[PDB]
Amino acid sequence: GLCSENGDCAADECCVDTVFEGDMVTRSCEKTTGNFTECPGLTPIA
Numbered sequence: 001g002l003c004s005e006n007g008d009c010a011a012d013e014c015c016v017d018t019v020f021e022g023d024m025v026t027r028s029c030e031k032t033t034g035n036f037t038e039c040p041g042l043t044p045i046a
Contacts, residue, residue, distance in 0.1 A: 003029065015027070016029075
């Protein structure tokens with residue numbers, strides 16, 4: 001379920017597939033409700 005385009009979730013929304021190690025893969029996406037919220041550019045998860 002990797003996000004190809006930036007706005008995979010939606011045109012206004014943003015999606016970005018994260019991945020640090022080979023143990024597992026992390027994905028993210030923010031829904032646009034009330035207030036706009038862009039996808040996170042940080043990946044402290046490890």
